[PDB]
Amino acid sequence: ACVHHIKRRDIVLKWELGEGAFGKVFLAECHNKMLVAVKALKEASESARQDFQREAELLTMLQHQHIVRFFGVCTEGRPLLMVFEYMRHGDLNRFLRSHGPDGPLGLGQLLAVASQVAAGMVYLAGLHFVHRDLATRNCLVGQGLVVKIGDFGMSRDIYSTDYYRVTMLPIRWMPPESILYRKFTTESDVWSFGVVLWEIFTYGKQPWYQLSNTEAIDCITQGRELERPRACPPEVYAIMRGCWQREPQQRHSIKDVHARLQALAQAP
Amino acid sequence: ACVHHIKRRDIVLKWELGEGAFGKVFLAECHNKMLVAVKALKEASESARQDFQREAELLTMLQHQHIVRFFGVCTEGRPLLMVFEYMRHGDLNRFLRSHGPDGPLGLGQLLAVASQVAAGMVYLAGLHFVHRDLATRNCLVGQGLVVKIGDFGMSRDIYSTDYYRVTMLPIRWMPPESILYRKFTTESDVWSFGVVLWEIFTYGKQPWYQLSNTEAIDCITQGRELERPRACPPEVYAIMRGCWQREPQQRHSIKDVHARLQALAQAP
Amino acid sequence: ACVHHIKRRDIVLKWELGEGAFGKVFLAECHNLKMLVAVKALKEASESARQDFQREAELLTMLQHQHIVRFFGVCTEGRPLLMVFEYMRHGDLNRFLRSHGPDAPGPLGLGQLLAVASQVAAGMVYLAGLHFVHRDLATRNCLVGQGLVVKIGDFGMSRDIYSTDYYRVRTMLPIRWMPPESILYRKFTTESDVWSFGVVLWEIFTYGKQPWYQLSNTEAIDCITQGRELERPRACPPEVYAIMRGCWQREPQQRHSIKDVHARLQALAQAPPV
Amino acid sequence: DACVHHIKRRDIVLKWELGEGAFGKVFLAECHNQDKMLVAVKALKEASESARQDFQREAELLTMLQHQHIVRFFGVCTEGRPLLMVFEYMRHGDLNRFLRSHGPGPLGLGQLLAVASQVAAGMVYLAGLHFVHRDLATRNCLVGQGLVVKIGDFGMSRDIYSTDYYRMLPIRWMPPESILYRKFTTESDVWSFGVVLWEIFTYGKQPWYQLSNTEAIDCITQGRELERPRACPPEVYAIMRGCWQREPQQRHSIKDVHARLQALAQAPPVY
Amino acid sequence: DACVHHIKRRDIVLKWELGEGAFGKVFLAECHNQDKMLVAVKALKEASESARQDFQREAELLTMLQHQHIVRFFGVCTEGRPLLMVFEYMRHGDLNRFLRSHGPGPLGLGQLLAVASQVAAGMVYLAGLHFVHRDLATRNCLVGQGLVVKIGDFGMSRDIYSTDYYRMLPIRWMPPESILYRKFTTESDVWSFGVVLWEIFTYGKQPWYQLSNTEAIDCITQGRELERPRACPPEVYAIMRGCWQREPQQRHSIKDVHARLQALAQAPPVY
Amino acid sequence: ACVHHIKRRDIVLKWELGEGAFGKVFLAECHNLKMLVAVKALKEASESARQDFQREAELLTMLQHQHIVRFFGVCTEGRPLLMVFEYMRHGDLNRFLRSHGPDAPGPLGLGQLLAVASQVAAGMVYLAGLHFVHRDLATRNCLVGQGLVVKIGDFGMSRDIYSTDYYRVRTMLPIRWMPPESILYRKFTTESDVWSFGVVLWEIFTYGKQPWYQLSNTEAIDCITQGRELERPRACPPEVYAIMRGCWQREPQQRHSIKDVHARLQALAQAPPV
Numbered sequence A, B: 001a002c003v004h005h006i007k008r009r010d011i012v013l014k015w016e017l018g019e020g021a022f023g024k025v026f027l028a029e030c031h032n033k034m035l036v037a038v039k040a041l042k043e044a045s046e047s048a049r050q051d052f053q054r055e056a057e058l059l060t061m062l063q064h065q066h067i068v069r070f071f072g073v074c075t076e077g078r079p080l081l082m083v084f085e086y087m088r089h090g091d092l093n094r095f096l097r098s099h100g101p102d103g104p105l106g107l108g109q110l111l112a113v114a115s116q117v118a119a120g121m122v123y124l125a126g127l128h129f130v131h132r133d134l135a136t137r138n139c140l141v142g143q144g145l146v147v148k149i150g151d152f153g154m155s156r157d158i159y160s161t162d163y164y165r166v167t168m169l170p171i172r173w174m175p176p177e178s179i180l181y182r183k184f185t186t187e188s189d190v191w192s193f194g195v196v197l198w199e200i201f202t203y204g205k206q207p208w209y210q211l212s213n214t215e216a217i218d219c220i221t222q223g224r225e226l227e228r229p230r231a232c233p234p235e236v237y238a239i240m241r242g243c244w245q246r247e248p249q250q251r252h253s254i255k256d257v258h259a260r261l262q263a264l265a266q267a268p
Numbered sequence C, F: 001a002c003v004h005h006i007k008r009r010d011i012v013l014k015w016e017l018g019e020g021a022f023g024k025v026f027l028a029e030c031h032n033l034k035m036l037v038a039v040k041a042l043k044e045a046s047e048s049a050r051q052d053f054q055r056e057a058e059l060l061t062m063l064q065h066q067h068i069v070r071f072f073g074v075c076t077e078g079r080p081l082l083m084v085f086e087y088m089r090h091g092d093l094n095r096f097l098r099s100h101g102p103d104a105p106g107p108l109g110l111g112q113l114l115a116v117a118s119q120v121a122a123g124m125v126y127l128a129g130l131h132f133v134h135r136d137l138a139t140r141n142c143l144v145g146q147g148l149v150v151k152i153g154d155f156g157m158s159r160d161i162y163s164t165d166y167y168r169v170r171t172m173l174p175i176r177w178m179p180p181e182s183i184l185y186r187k188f189t190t191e192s193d194v195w196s197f198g199v200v201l202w203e204i205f206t207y208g209k210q211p212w213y214q215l216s217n218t219e220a221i222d223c224i225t226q227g228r229e230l231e232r233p234r235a236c237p238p239e240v241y242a243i244m245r246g247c248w249q250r251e252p253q254q255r256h257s258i259k260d261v262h263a264r265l266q267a268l269a270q271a272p273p274v
Numbered sequence D, E: 001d002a003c004v005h006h007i008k009r010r011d012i013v014l015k016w017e018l019g020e021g022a023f024g025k026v027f028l029a030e031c032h033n034q035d036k037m038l039v040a041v042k043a044l045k046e047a048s049e050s051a052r053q054d055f056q057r058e059a060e061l062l063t064m065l066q067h068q069h070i071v072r073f074f075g076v077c078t079e080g081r082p083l084l085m086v087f088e089y090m091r092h093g094d095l096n097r098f099l100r101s102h103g104p105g106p107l108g109l110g111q112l113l114a115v116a117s118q119v120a121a122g123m124v125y126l127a128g129l130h131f132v133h134r135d136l137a138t139r140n141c142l143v144g145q146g147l148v149v150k151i152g153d154f155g156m157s158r159d160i161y162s163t164d165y166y167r168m169l170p171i172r173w174m175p176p177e178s179i180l181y182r183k184f185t186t187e188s189d190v191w192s193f194g195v196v197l198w199e200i201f202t203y204g205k206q207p208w209y210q211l212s213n214t215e216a217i218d219c220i221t222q223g224r225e226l227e228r229p230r231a232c233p234p235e236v237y238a239i240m241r242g243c244w245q246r247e248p249q250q251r252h253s254i255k256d257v258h259a260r261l262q263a264l265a266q267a268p269p270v271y
């Protein structure tokens, strides 16, 4: 079997970690004994099943120190199962909110986070693979402050106001061309990584929380940047400015963002 | 047969009136002897055939003095045929360009045009039917300066620069919410009718012709209106301002636009 | 041929009268059968929905009454599916009671309020006689025409338009109009519909207020299941209120028959006023 | 479908029927492949297509569940008729029939708490998984050797324990919001666990036994709680009353309830 | 498919074969339902599924065409084998075989212009419809009573008039852009009409008859025009040279060409 | 089993090497068979495309040569379809000739230019011997690895990436690389490919310029069909140019055999320089 198939029998559900409109996710033990995360899709129309096959067909091939690991799939009945490594501390947005002045985190730790996500994004960009909804909700955090990108899931249900109706679009993380022209690239993803870099250094506020979805857009579009955070070096806020270039071409490569971050994270 | 079926044999092609990527349109004579327009779709995948059935199923029911008349359809082989009344003077955008200082038209005639399109739009709005691409290219002109709305056709091919890639969207005719939020209503159609009213009173210039598709958007969005035309009364340019309200709710009803226009067109 | 089929081409839409997740409804012209009608058009149209739609035409093509909205035919020849009905110019009785109440002419007479209730009761006697059970009787679901002719305007898309009248479970149930056995047990009978009629009679005499409008759906239930009966409206004579009570007995067996309800409302209708 | 665990029919020997219903029979049987051992076999002879899909659905789910206090499921066979589901055999049967047997020798407070704790444990697992049981009662629990108690999820209880429903919903096990608004949550289950607790400490009485199905509903909704059993310490009645808050939100977690019950079980109070 | 016009096989009587090919035979036949009249019947016995769809395609198209100077098409039958297409019978056959017959009694200048005009008229209709013929020659035109000439669109010319192709493209009827860039437009047709004109005024010579298929191509592309026929007035040679501009865009419309030819036909020049 | 199948799970993508309407191409890791490869992935994948893709695997699974890019297997187990090949680190010979020409190290030696031409000719002898006809020989369609190993890197998505090298008809044909009979008649043979090779030899000796780069596609045709032969490059000794002429004879029969072309290029390769 070309894609990796895990047998249902080799899985034991332990508890629920998260819920959506299509999916649930559980902690479970896998035999052949280790813990894992299981995306159970119970809303299983053939359109949705095929989508789920296509998704597994892709993830089977991806592999990076900062892409949440995919162990495999079982379309042997219902619900449809996708199996990943368990990330013990969850999604980064809830993690930042935990571990912030509501002690906080060492500026080296905030830099290691940023760094570790940038790595993951360096992998996707060399693949010319566009993510289209990067955010701290869509990254995961494991033992030993390991961070990785936990692709999508059902974040649109969970973190509801972050998106907006039309489709549900993460407008607070999107550059203007993605908004206006609807173009999604590598360059729009960098932009979103600038917004991520903000999230990390605000210990996980919603971008423009003060503002609502329809006025949020008039801000992003009218070219107003986001404020430098208290916890934020101007060096770092330079990196953000370098992500936010109005013009996609004049924005930095995620490769260079990744180098500056990894340089700072060692030697702040 | 519930939809009106015309027999191929009862049609004789005379010449080609227009061309696209999906369709052609011909002048032909219909027996049971009169002239007509025939949309011949030769690109006939089942997805496209079904779409074409759905379209005929709808038009069979619509009927208005300012909606180009639909005589019927034949899916009896290939190419798929839709039959309409022949409009002798074509699309209004080419018509305005003909009959303008490149004599021109009596301000009563420019008002009769505007008026006659507004009627057509009054019919669609009471049906809560949203057109989504109104323009002078998408209206037609017959003997005795009769104007009607000639729904779509293949205008995206013919009048190419009027749209923009993503889908092809008539950005120069769209309000900001249609642009930004992607919402299309009755209220966005009125807005587009304001732009139409402009086209008529510029004898058919492209909105923001000076400007290109990506800067055109920064204009519409930043709330800059279009200049009052030379040939244009301020009364009329009041009607346009009343279509262009940033806020869809504060825009006029097409019913009221239609009354003011019909009032002026009698008594300028 | 068995069910009557209208041709699409014999239809000209004029405009929209009403809107729903499942259906829209237009005023149209109908050629042959020129005369006006209302067309229910369903652009939903799976096959489960396409079947239900044929099933309903198969039923409605056999019903006929002075006070059941008249059904002319159906066309399943493509999309959207079409069901053609008589046009009732003044629409749904709820919006009509609200239009024409203390909120000239002025508010309906008592005699007109009675004439309205008699005509609904009339429609409902026909259904009970077929041992047919409506399950959602309400003024929103009766229609009103020229010179105050009133008829039962069946389903449509009531759960979308008058959304706060229903409560969730994923069934949406007209809790405010339902007796205890229909809430608790989900037993819907002719006797549950008589209950609902009582609630309609209240709507009528309050120019179309939501029953227990001051209560949420959950405390609305509490009040109903506990026994609490709605207040006599300011407009409601005590003969009429007795009717409502008649319909609101807790034991289904003990409730009045729509046939009796209907003769008393007709009697009162004809009787001179105070 | 090597994925769910398949048992071969040939590796079963039916010994005798334990129980009977409208959709199932259950038999004690011997399973080859531990060369031999006893199991209980759910056999469905109804067996439409609609009913065979639900049976392969239920088994696909049960395959993944595992807990000291959820009836162990060994596997399934849909190679022909009847459809088989194989579970561990629990020697003493349903906890209701066990409680009537072992009550006025009667069971020690320590034992009744073990029983309550063991059920509660099973309910912690289901709540963990945000999985609603909807029909938790002593009759839907089974009892093994060494007073092991587990939850016995599917079967034909509505046929056997007929009067405990009304037409069919276990109204005596149900809170006002389940009865009135048809709402089932981990909160409505806790309510039912409250009643289960009552059942244990009454050695298996039907709640409101003295009232009919209609007037039962009336007391539930009107606010009226069940009476403190003779056998029930006031600490344990606190636990019952915690589960019986009218406001779902104000009702204890199963996780606390289980933690108290497990503590008391190992270190009971005087009474 | 009441839509295209169907002829019943029973209402046909085959009289004799006129012609023969790899995909067709054509017969003269009598059509009942004008109780009786002659027609030509294209009969295809090849008749794959691929080839039956193209035949119902071609007929669906021909049904809609109508012109004084396009071979009239009466209808079709795909009720079995062979597949039938029915056309008006044109008594004198292809205009090439007619031109060789009627040349050195020879035809009047007035008549040759009528011929050129009548073909041109047919080509105006196709250009009107933005419809490219791709293989316009005297052999693909037919001639009726009273020197009526029309275009005889489909058939088996490549089989009969074999040498006029190369392996198969009518390179002697084709402009440099058709040969070199495989481009067919109403412009490349006009080019071919130019050659057709040559053919008329040479009483049916093959263009470059004296050259082989390879070296023909070489003269076409190198720029070299065909010679003014003896029978061809300089006004008419102007028309030929107009159609032979190397630049498609600089080549006359068929509509002008037709207008001149029709004028000259009614009012010829001296020669 | 017949054709070799690689498992998807035995693939880790590392990054993208190239892109097209039909295909992308990644550098990957391949486990078992750890070693590097190039994976052709087609996300197009109708069935006409899915079949062509199986047909090509069925052919490529039988070819094997020192100078035909090595084919490891294919997986049709889902989307996207996968074809696994040896990784050639320095990519397509055209981009490589342009990299490493007058536009240190410095521009390739004559000996290296000859070593490159010999290796292509070598690959092309194998195809002619199978009487297989490439139809699009060009430096864009040969691949270059570690220490100047060169191989024929078949199709891919050449018509998208090197789009101006082709001309329309809706077929896209490498007009600049085609002899008269292939332009005019569309006759593609071993003899047409030898022609193309001559054009490759010119590309090689011009560090990868487009033939007739100063002419449009239509006047490029004129010049070819008229007889006009490309200029001797500044880098090209007259022995080598004689080779090109050898390949550019107008009569296919009169042209040299790739086998001869290949022995002369190998001879020159070994010969000491001036």
Ligand SMILES: O=C(Nc1ccc(N2CCOCC2)cc1N1CCOCC1)c1cccc(Oc2ccccc2)c1
Pocket (backbone or CB within 6 Å): A017, A018, A019, A025, A037, A039, A068, A084, A085, A086, A087, A088, A089, A090, A091, A137, A138, A139, A140, A150, A151, A152, A153, A154, A155
């Ligand atoms: O390991 C995963 N996720 C996880 C692990 C642990 C936890 N809790 C541990 C205890 O304290 C609270 C957090 C929560 C999550 N989730 C649930 C899914 O929503 C993203 C947060 C995981 C692994 C692979 C895929 C996966 O699916 C996703 C990924 C991102 C966003 C949504 C779903 C989740």
Ligand SMILES: O=C(Nc1ccc(N2CCOCC2)cc1N1CCOCC1)c1cccc(Oc2ccccc2)c1
Pocket (backbone or CB within 6 Å): B017, B018, B019, B025, B037, B039, B068, B084, B085, B086, B087, B088, B089, B090, B091, B137, B138, B139, B140, B150, B151, B152, B153, B154, B155
């Ligand atoms: O009557 C129709 N259209 C027409 C009539 C006449 C003419 N010419 C007459 C001679 O001087 C030039 C103009 C041109 C058109 N067209 C072609 C299609 O593009 C819209 C202009 C007609 C009728 C029904 C449907 C229809 O399809 C449309 C409608 C709008 C836009 C595009 C196609 C066209």
Ligand SMILES: O=C(Nc1ccc(N2CCOCC2)cc1N1CCOCC1)c1cccc(Oc2ccccc2)c1
Pocket (backbone or CB within 6 Å): C017, C018, C019, C025, C038, C040, C069, C085, C086, C087, C088, C089, C090, C091, C092, C140, C141, C142, C143, C153, C154, C155, C156, C157, C158
């Ligand atoms: O004729 C019908 N109905 C009508 C007539 C008129 C009007 N407006 C008149 C102007 O002031 C506002 C109301 C509204 C309706 N509707 C809309 C759909 O909601 C039922 C009321 C009609 C006739 C037969 C069937 C039918 O479908 C229904 C009926 C009731 C409820 C839902 C659908 C509607």
Ligand SMILES: O=C(Nc1ccc(N2CCOCC2)cc1N1CCOCC1)c1cccc(Oc2ccccc2)c1
Pocket (backbone or CB within 6 Å): D018, D019, D020, D026, D040, D042, D071, D087, D088, D089, D090, D091, D092, D093, D094, D139, D140, D141, D142, D152, D153, D154, D155, D156, D157
């Ligand atoms: O082992 C099982 N159950 C059992 C064991 C033993 C006995 N007897 C022991 C000796 O004195 C007489 C009773 C009775 C049962 N039943 C039969 C079905 O009614 C549930 C009690 C068993 C194991 C797994 C699943 C299963 O299916 C159920 C579970 C609950 C309710 C109904 C069926 C039964």
Ligand SMILES: O=C(Nc1ccc(N2CCOCC2)cc1N1CCOCC1)c1cccc(Oc2ccccc2)c1
Pocket (backbone or CB within 6 Å): E018, E019, E020, E026, E040, E042, E071, E087, E088, E089, E090, E091, E092, E093, E094, E139, E140, E141, E142, E152, E153, E154, E155, E156, E157
């Ligand atoms: O009536 C038709 N054609 C005809 C009439 C008569 C004659 N003879 C008349 C007496 O001296 C001998 C020749 C020959 C033809 N053919 C046969 C097929 O080769 C095209 C000339 C005719 C009518 C309609 C369609 C049709 O099919 C074609 C048309 C052009 C070329 C080939 C077939 C033929």
Ligand SMILES: O=C(Nc1ccc(N2CCOCC2)cc1N1CCOCC1)c1cccc(Oc2ccccc2)c1
Pocket (backbone or CB within 6 Å): F017, F018, F019, F025, F038, F040, F069, F085, F086, F087, F088, F089, F090, F091, F092, F140, F141, F142, F143, F153, F154, F155, F156, F157, F158
């Ligand atoms: O290994 C292969 N190819 C490669 C290796 C490396 C590189 N880059 C290295 C860094 O500097 C830029 C070039 C590029 C390619 N490509 C991309 C696809 O276009 C063929 C060149 C390869 C191996 C086998 C088959 C294959 O598919 C082809 C080959 C040629 C043309 C099209 C597809 C590619």
Ligand SMILES: [Zn+2]
Pocket (backbone or CB within 6 Å): A005, A006, A007, A008, A073, A074, A075, A076, D001, D003
């Ligand atoms: Zn499986």
Ligand SMILES: [Zn+2]
Pocket (backbone or CB within 6 Å): B005, B006, B007, B008, B073, B074, B075, B076, E001, E003
């Ligand atoms: Zn037809």
Ligand SMILES: [Zn+2]
Pocket (backbone or CB within 6 Å): B001, B002, C005, C006, C007, C008, C074, C075, C076, C077
């Ligand atoms: Zn119909």
Ligand SMILES: [Zn+2]
Pocket (backbone or CB within 6 Å): D006, D007, D008, D009, D076, D077, D078, D079
């Ligand atoms: Zn089996």
Ligand SMILES: [Zn+2]
Pocket (backbone or CB within 6 Å): E006, E007, E008, E009, E076, E077, E078, E079
């Ligand atoms: Zn026939």
Ligand SMILES: [Zn+2]
Pocket (backbone or CB within 6 Å): A001, A002, F005, F006, F007, F008, F074, F075, F076, F077
């Ligand atoms: Zn595979």
